[PDB]
RNA sequence: GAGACACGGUCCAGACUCCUACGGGAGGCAGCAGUGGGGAAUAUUGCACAAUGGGCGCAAGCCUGAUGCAGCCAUGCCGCG
RNA sequence: UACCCGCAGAAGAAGCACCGGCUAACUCCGUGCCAGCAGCCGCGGUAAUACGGAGGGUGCAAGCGUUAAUCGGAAUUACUG
RNA sequence: GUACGGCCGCAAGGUUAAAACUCAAAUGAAUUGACGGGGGCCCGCACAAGCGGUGGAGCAUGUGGUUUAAUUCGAUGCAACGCGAAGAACCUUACCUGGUCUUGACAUCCACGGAAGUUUUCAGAGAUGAGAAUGUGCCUUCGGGAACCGUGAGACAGGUG
RNA sequence: ACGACCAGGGCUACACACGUGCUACAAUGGCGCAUACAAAGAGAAGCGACCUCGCGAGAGCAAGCGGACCUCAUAAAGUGCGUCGUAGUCCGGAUUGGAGUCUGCAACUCGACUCCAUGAAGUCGGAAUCGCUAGUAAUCGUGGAUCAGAAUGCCACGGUG
RNA sequence: GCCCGGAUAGCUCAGUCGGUAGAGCAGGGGAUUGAAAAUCCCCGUGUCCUUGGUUCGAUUCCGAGUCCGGGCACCA
RNA sequence: AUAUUCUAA
RNA sequence: AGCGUCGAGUCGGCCUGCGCGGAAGA
RNA sequence: CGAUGUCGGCUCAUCACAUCCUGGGGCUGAAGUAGGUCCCAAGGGUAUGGCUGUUCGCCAUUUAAAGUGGUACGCGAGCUG
């Protein structure tokens, strides 16, 4: 976290070369995507700064005077400065704090059942109950679309919209394995028992606008349709071809004795195939996002462990562990998030153009 | 030819490599060393005919990558630090 | 060249595998069904003689392990049996 | 005992008969149990025979849940739920909010300075802080202590974590 | 500071679900008046008589008793006589208003008790389910621990049966 | 494009033809069970597709749409 | 007459 | 208008007449 | 309606220009090469196959280019069927 913060320094220093000179203003293109490089990690750099003069006075706080007396009303003042860059601290969350569109829309928390049958199902229950809650707190409108009630309570399976400011900012990171470690409802021996539950956290994609079949994107072409009809069916240019060019869809008709109906019936097609084809892509791609979230449900997958016996949390991917699972099963999400935000951050300011 | 259907002979055909004045020619490391390649992996393009053997010779000798030796490698066995 | 004699000075010369059982050799720290080990049985899910390091120990030693391959153990193709 | 091939068959199929791959077992008999909607024999308000309740009402009380700054922690089939608690207004109290302390509310050890105690005032929600009178006893080699209070250490105390 | 001190809050929250109790729905009863018959137990910062005052909870004054002595302390169901006459009642006593009492630095959150007023649900409880074999069940009072105060709980005690 | 039928509880369906809607399965609460089913007791559930009329009053009777299903779009 | 089921340390 | 200089007209709306473009086929 | 033979192919065409190529230009978000777009221009030129009765279309491979239309969607007293 502190290394990371040492990296900005790194690339703070090397950008700030050119200020009026002549190097990179030959082509406002490069210049474009280095001086704005800048602008966001200059706010973080100054305030870091900051921390990092207060740190090396702590090594000349212990004893001021020289002999131990007066040393303990003095540090008392250092005590105070101690408590001012414990603020710098609380600032460094804010200049941190995302700050992208993307982070501000809805979400889709999907909690599936992992290994464990019944007792996996149960902790998705407490797991679904946990978000709920954090989603309640902050304020948000949590709603369920699709629910599969385990045997002996929780769920196989809860999808559930949660609606408000910022929510995908705060649940991207929910999304993976969760394991549980406890003794279960459904255990008769009072053996513990390793069960995960999968989450995904999707954002939600605007709707679905089915747009207009825009004539100047087809190429329709009339022909004498084939097979029985006398001379009508000799003589009149009865069949259509409508090509799509964008997608390139193909719809011939040619049912009808009439090339209006043929024409009518073929856009008609064309506009059902055309709107089926770009919801299989969506489904496709929805089906994709979530397969990569989900890993699989296997106890071996995990971005996070709950173990109850100890009352442990330990997010697995920044080494954290926290003996307030009591809390955590509650709600207070807060005490995991938070860290989790400050180091993606950490990494999105220090790698944007690299 | 005593002996071969002949490793470093002949003829034919074939594939491959090379030379060519384009007409035509040349060649065969499964000797020793060595090169490329293949491979988990296997050595020096030494020295000498002094010894033992072989060819020819009346013999002296000449030839002998057989052989005797050296080089390389903990590859093994044995011995010693 | 083998071998012999002289000179100086401990001087120039120790590693490799293993230590849960089978199997000779045990403890501490770290990790927390992860990372990893593993010939078989198995070990590891916050008090690990089994993982990784350390200290100690055992076995081999200019080798030591690993892998491959063969017979053995296998009376598990049995002639012996 | 399957595939492929062969032979047989009207067919159904039979017959002959592999390999890959996979497991560290699979298996036989017997032993001790446990279990059976097996058998036999017994017992207990276990049923039956009775009597009175609970489940509905209002209230008490505990619990789950939900709520909350906090609703402290524990008990959770029988064998948790008027249970730990033989008694939460303060105290208790472990919880929350705010105000405070840092060898320290509670011990031992050392140095320094003071007898304790006694009344009284102000500020403060109180903790606490700042004053002012008021004593200077008890053991005594009248050198020293030990009755307990302050102040400074750093060994440690402290923790219903 | 996960240690320590303090004040104030909270453990008493309340769409709801369950357990254990209490009180009822009445006439084998209610109310009024009169009147019998227990056991066991507690008591010194304690139990507190008598007398006086108060509708009452209580208050004042104060004996006695570390108790087979004094106090708590009137047992109640029962019995006799009266009334009510099957009504949501002269059943039931929730809830709420007003006015008090006492404990306690302090009863707002959050005490118990008293008085006047108020007079809810409830007319014997679906599926189900509990206890009990005799001085038992059922029903009737009585005491104690904890405790300043604060039992319908608990632990004891007799009565009727 | 036209035509016939349909739109009623969460799902599948009755029903009514002017007033005052049901069923089964889901759902909720209780019970039974060591627990989950099955079972048992108690409950709740609808703007009767959307509009614009007629009407004192429309789920019901008109006239539009919308969605669904079933025809048909022919003679040549 | 009717009695199904019990994952995974 | 042209570039303060230069020395008579000048500017763009209205009413209306006739024309111009817009105007490619076997 | 006392008959004006109807798709496509074949043969043979002929005209228009709203130009596919070649010729001449303006503008270009025209550096060059190559494009885009619009104007002028009808002299000449303007695929062969696979599939399908096909017209159309897709596909293969060419070409400077494989124009768009009219002609009883030209052409059965010319062929096919
Ligand atoms: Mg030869
Ligand atoms: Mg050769
Ligand atoms: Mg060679
Ligand atoms: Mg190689
Ligand atoms: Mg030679
Ligand atoms: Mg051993
Ligand atoms: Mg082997
Ligand atoms: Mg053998
Ligand atoms: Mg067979
Ligand atoms: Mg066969
Ligand atoms: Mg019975
Ligand atoms: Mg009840
Ligand atoms: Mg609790
Ligand atoms: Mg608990
Ligand atoms: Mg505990
Ligand atoms: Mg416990
Ligand atoms: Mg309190
Ligand atoms: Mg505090
Ligand atoms: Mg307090
Ligand atoms: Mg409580
Ligand atoms: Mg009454
Ligand atoms: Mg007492
Ligand atoms: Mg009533
Ligand atoms: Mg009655
Ligand atoms: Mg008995
Ligand atoms: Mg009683
Ligand atoms: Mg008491
Ligand atoms: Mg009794
Ligand atoms: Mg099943
Ligand atoms: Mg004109
Ligand atoms: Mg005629
Ligand atoms: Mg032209
Ligand atoms: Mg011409
Ligand atoms: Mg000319
Ligand atoms: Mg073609
Ligand atoms: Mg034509
Ligand atoms: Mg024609
Ligand atoms: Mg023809
Ligand atoms: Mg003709």
């Known amino acids: 976290i502190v290394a990371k913060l040492e990296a900005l320094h790194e690339r703070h ?6 200020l009026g000179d002549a190097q ?16 966001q990690l200059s706010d973080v750099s100054r305030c870091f700064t900051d921390w990092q003069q207060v740190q090396e006075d702590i090594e000349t706080a212990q004893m001021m005077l020289d002999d131990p007396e007066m040393r303990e009303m003095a540090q008392d003042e250092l005590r105070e400065a101690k ?3 414990e603020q710098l601290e609380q600032q460094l969350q804010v200049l941190l704090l995302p700050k992208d569109p993307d982070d501000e829309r809805n979400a889709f928390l999907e909690v599936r059942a992992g290994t464990g049958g019944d007792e996996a199902a149960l902790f998705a229950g407490d797991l679904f109950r946990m978000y709920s809650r954090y989603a309640e707190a902050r304020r948000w409108r949590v709603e369920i679309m699709s629910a599969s009630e385990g045997e002996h309570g929780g769920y196989k399976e809860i999808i559930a919209k949660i609606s408000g400011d910022g929510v995908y900012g705060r649940l991207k990171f929910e999304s993976g394995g969760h394991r549980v470690q406890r003794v279960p409802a459904t255990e008769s021996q009072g053996r513990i028992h390793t069960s995960a539950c999968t989450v995904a956290v999707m954002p939600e994609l605007p709707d679905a606008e089915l747009p207009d079949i825009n004539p100047a994107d087809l190429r329709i072409d009339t022909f004498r349709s084939s097979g029985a009809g006398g001379q009508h069916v000799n003589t009149t240019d009865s069949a259509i071809r409508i090509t799509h060019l964008p997608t390139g869809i193909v719809v011939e008709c ?8 043929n024409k009518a019936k073929a856009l008609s097609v064309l506009g059902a195939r055309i709107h089926a084809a770009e919801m299989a892509k969506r489904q496709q791609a929805e089906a994709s996002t979530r ?8 106890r071996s997958d995990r971005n996070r462990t709950y173990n109850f016996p100890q009352g442990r949390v330990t997010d697995h991917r920044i080494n954290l562990t926290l003996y307030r699972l009591d809390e955590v099963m509650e709600g207070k999400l807060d005490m995991l998030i938070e860290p989790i935000i400050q180091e993606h951050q950490a990494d999105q300011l220090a790698a944007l153009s690299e």
Do not use: C, M, P, W
Request: without cysteine; charged residues 40%; negative net charge.
């Open 13 to 18: 220093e090397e950008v700030q070369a050119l």
């Open 24 to 39: 990179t203003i030959a082509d406002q293109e490069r210049f474009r995507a280095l001086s704005r490089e800048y602008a």
């Open 83 to 85: 408590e001012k860059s």
């Open 254 to 261: 040619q049912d009808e004795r009439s090339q209006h109906k």
């Open 291 to 298: 397969r990569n979230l989900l890993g699989s449900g296997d």
